[PDB]
């Protein structure tokens, strides 16, 4: 077994489990006495003040029950042991994920690292005390697993790999990122290749290159109210902020004076000059935008109405690596929380990390009802704002 | 009686060292009696003799209980590691199933009849001292878990989960729930199949050496609980005392708060909020209030309510949980939770956010997650919910609103008050209608705002305020387009602040000059509200800006 230490100074994680529903507790129960009849994990005494906490979910399109520990308070304190990823994957056409996490379960974890994988499953309305667990073999869901694997999964691909020289393959977590300009079906095959290569040693579609900007699109009217020229302005004043190029001197010329909303205000030459000036630099990047790999990657996500949804991801606010949508039935956290996964999927395959979200929904709310939608082996950060932005309409 | 069970192993805390306190000296009185305590102990095998070469001591005292042994671990426990919480939380009647006979078996003598861990046993080293500190004193160490140890609660309770875990898995019919030393056995068994299985536990808790009371047990139901009163087919709290008071201390309306919170949970639509109020400000424990009309209307019909004794009914698996809220006014709400149509299982209240401005419709929905997670806990599943909503209401907001919310399967109930929101701002700017321009300025050394507005239809004024801030200047703004505007009006102003309060539709607020704008919208027919950015030669915005600028 390969050693472990925590960051000096740092203690294990000591993290509440949040209450959970009365099946997931019979489903996690199910799942554990499995796992301890496998030596996967052990009973624990109470000389382990650790916990980290555990729930149940179900894998895309699956009806069987999947563990899932939620080990962010461990990998905050683990990171001085993992802490490169390929800049070309984001160009390929098609990108396959593959769950390996499987793999991890052969591998024994470091006997005096165990302590701190500690997790309890609760009782309902406490009657009997918690069904207290560690771990025994590198665990699902902490970052120290693929590290240590990472050596063994190398030797697994070698082959492969030599086999082919133009699939890119990455790892974050338990998924592996599979990419290739290949057609299709010639990808799947490729995949299909993958597995079986998978399956001898215990293991049984996204389109990097289709995703583009989300631009601050501009309206286009008949006519022009004072309002609607109140609302343009404040757009491009927001949009240059980010923007390096923009301006509206010509526009807001037009308002000079205590004009009423509905007053309708014919436009000169200059502004549609101007006006047109803006568009064509707000479709194209921001420029001076880079990803510093020792800072991290934030999203902030607003709430469009009609199932709609859009997000940006930056690392200095004001200075978008990333814009984009999602869409698509009447509840609010759901879809929240299909795009919280999506937008990760897509900064995993980018930049191999994930952002911190800020979730514009009230903390109790999330907790409650995020693990009856979520469907990844990874979780990331996130933080709760409660402030209502104007940001609503800039993205519309 | 001590126990063969397997020891917990125990460290102390990584770099420190066991405690080495000084022994404090003694009366000869306290002296003596200690010994014939520790020798008493010594032969029931709980301590053990040791020599002076055990370099480690905790002090000791004695006092009148009759004498009763009293050992000081607080720098033991400073030094002993951190052990695994003994409860996530404690259970609540309202979640337990109804069983046929019950029975409560007192462990008696619970931490002492466990084994301390071999390797940690000489850090649990103290001496009685000698006469007046002439000889050596004598030396004893536990073997066994001591009161008031950090880590005895955690270690007797591991010791019972293993204990019963043969015995749990032989007889699944039965249930045994644990809560410090107690063990309260039910079971859906006749009273001597029931009686049977009893003398089987006892006679199982006997064979890891632990005893237990008799066939004439201490207690038998209706048992009193951490507060509660329960019965074989209901339970409910324990007899709430409202006292009857000439004057009134703070330590008084304290003591009603809680009893009155504690009553909550069974007895429905408990109000403590203008009782509460009271307690704002300082003030000191024996400090008397004089109750004001709102707090004596209160207190009076909380007496009411509790006249009539009522009760609460357990858990059916089989059956769905219904939750249903009503709203009492001040922000103030209340719930209920029943199977069967008002037969509760328990009660409870909802305050409002003491804090910022909310609405009716915000609040329902902060204690729909309240109660939703109270179900989870006690219940492991979700009610159904009864509101007083329209599903047009609801629509309207869930929509329309900035935030994410959602709330589970839920139907109408036609229970006035019922949720409403008050007004609506426009989605389009109104035609036949004056444009208020309005902005604030505020100084920040002196703290002399001013606050006004310019229109489309000539119109101005400028109001001076003194001790405010922008925000409150910006607020007093709107408030005065408001109104000198008819029942139709448009407003711009350049606060992202205001619009932010004011697009999320509050009808109550703790500023009152919030209170003030709620009053205006309410009263419009129309109003639509724009924002524009500060300084950018925005017609209207300019104007308005000078005037305040001054
Ligand atoms: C057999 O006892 P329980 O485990 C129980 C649970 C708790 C949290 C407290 C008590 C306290 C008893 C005393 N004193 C009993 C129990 C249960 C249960 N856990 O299902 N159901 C009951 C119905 C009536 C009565 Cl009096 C007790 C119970």
């Not at chain 2, 006749?190 to 299985?197: A, D, S, V």
């Not at chain 2, 304290?254 to 949970?265: F, R």
Request: charged share 25%.
């Amino acid at each position: 077994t390969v050693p472990v230490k925590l960051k000096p100074g740092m203690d294990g994680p000591k993290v509440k489990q949040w209450p959970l529903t009365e099946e997931k507790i019979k489903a996690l129960v199910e799942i554990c006495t499995e796992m301890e009849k496998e030596g996967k994990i052990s009973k624990i005494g109470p000389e382990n003040p650790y916990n980290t906490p555990v729930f149940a979910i179900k894998k895309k399109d699956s009806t069987k029950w999947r563990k899932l520990v939620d080990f962010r308070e461990l990998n905050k304190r683990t990171q001085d042991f993992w802490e490169p990823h390929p800049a070309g994957l984001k160009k390929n056409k098609s990108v396959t994920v593959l769950d390996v996490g499987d793999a991890y379960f052969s591998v024994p974890l470091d006997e005096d690292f165990r302590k701190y994988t500690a997790f309890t499953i609760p009782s309902i309305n406490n009657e009997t005390p918690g069904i207290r667990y560690q771990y025994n073999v590198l665990p699902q869901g902490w970052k120290g697993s693929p590290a240590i694997f990472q050596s063994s999964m190398t030797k697994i691909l070698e082959p492969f790999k030599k086999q082919n020289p133009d699939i890119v393959i990455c790892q974050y977590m338990d998924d592996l990122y599979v990419g290739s300009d290949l057609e299709i079906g010639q990808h799947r095959t490729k995949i299909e290749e993958l597995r079986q290569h998978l399956l001898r040693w215990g293991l049984t579609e996204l389109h990097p290159d289709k995703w583009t900007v989300q631009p601050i699109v501009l309206p286009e009217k008949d006519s022009w109210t004072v309002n609607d020229i109140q609302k343009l302005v404040g757009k491009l004043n927001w949009a240059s902020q980010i923007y390096p190029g923009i301006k509206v001197r010509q526009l807001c010329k037009l308002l000079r004076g205590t004009k009423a909303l509905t007053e309708v205000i014919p436009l000169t030459e200059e502004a549609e000059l101007e006006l047109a000036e803006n568009r064509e630099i707000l479709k194209e990047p921001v420029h001076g935008v880079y990803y510093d790999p020792s800072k991290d990657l934030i999203a902030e996500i607003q709430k469009q109405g009609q199932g709609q949804w859009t997000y940006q991801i930056y690392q200095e606010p004001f200075k978008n690596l990333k814009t984009g949508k999602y869409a698509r039935h009447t509840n609010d956290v759901k879809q929240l929380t299909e795009a919280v996964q999506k937008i990760t999927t897509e900064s995993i395959v980018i930049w191999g990390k994930t952002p911190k979200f800020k979730l514009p929904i009230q903390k109790e709310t999330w907790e409650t009802w995020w693990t009856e939608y979520w469907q990844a082996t990874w979780i990331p950060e996130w933080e709760f704002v409660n402030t209502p932005p104007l940001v609503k309409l800039w993205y519309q | 009686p001590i126990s063969p069970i397997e020891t917990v192993p125990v460290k102390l805390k990584p770099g420190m060292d066991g405690p080495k306190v000084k022994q404090w000296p003694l009366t000869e009185e306290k002296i003596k009696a200690l010994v014939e305590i520790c020798t008493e102990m010594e032969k029931e095998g709980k301590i053990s003799k040791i020599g002076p070469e055990n370099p480690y001591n905790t002090p000791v005292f004695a006092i009148k209980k009759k004498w009763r042994k009293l050992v000081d671990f607080r720098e033991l426990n400073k030094r002993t590691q951190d052990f695994w919480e003994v409860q996530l939380g404690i259970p609540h009647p309202a979640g337990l199933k109804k069983n046929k006979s019950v029975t409560v078996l007192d462990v008696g003598d619970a931490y002492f009849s466990v084994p301390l861990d071999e390797d940690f046993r000489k850090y649990t080293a103290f001496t009685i001292p000698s006469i007046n500190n002439e000889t050596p004193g004598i030396r004893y160490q536990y073997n066994v878990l001591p009161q008031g140890w950090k880590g005895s609660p955690a270690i007797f309770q591991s010791s019972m989960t293993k204990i019963l875990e043969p015995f749990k898995k032989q007889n699944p019919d039965i249930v045994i729930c644990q809560y410090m030393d107690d063990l309260y056995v039910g079971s859906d068994l006749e009273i001597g199949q029931h009686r049977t299985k009893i003398e089987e536990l006892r006679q199982h808790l006997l064979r890891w050496g632990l005893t237990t009371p008799d066939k004439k047990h201490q207690k038998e139901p209706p048992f009193l609980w951490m507060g509660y009163e329960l019965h074989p087919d209901k339970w409910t709290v324990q007899p709430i005392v409202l006292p009857e008071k000439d004057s009134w201390t703070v330590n008084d309306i304290q003591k009603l708060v809680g009893k009155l919170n504690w009553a909550s949970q069974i007895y429905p639509g408990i109000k403590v909020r203008q009782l509460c109020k009271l307690l704002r400000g300082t003030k000191a424990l024996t400090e008397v209030i004089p109750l004001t009309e709102e707090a004596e209307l209160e207190l009076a019909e909380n007496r009411e309510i509790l006249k009539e004794p009522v009760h609460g009914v357990y858990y059916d698996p089989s059956k769905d949980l219904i939750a249903e809220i009503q709203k009492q006014g001040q922000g103030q709400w209340t719930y209920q939770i029943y199977q069967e149509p008002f037969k509760n299982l328990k009660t409870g209240k909802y305050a409002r956010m003491r804090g910022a401005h909310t609405n009716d419709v915000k609040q329902l929905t902060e204690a729909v997650q309240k109660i939703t997670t109270e179900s989870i806990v006690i219940w492991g599943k979700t009610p159904k919910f009864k509101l007083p909503i329209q599903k047009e209401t609801w629509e309207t907001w869930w929509t329309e609103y900035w935030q994410a919310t959602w709330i589970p399967e839920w139907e109408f109930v036609n229970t006035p008050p019922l949720v409403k929101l008050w007004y609506q701002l426009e989605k389009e700017p109104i035609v036949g209608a004056e444009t208020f321009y309005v902005d604030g300025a505020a100084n920040r050394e002196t703290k002399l705002g001013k606050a006004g507005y310019v229109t489309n239809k000539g119109r101005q004024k400028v109001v001076p305020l003194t001790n405010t801030t922008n925000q409150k200047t910006e607020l007093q703004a709107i408030y005065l387009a408001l109104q000198d505007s008819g029942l139709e009006v448009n407003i711009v102003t350049d606060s992202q602040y205001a619009l932010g309060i004011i697009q999320a539709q509050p009808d109550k607020s703790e500023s009152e000059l919030v209170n003030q704008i709620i009053e205006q919208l309410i009263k419009k027919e129309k109003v639509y509200l724009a924002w524009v950015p500060a300084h950018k030669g925005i017609g209207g915005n300019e104007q308005v800006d000078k005037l305040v600028s001054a």
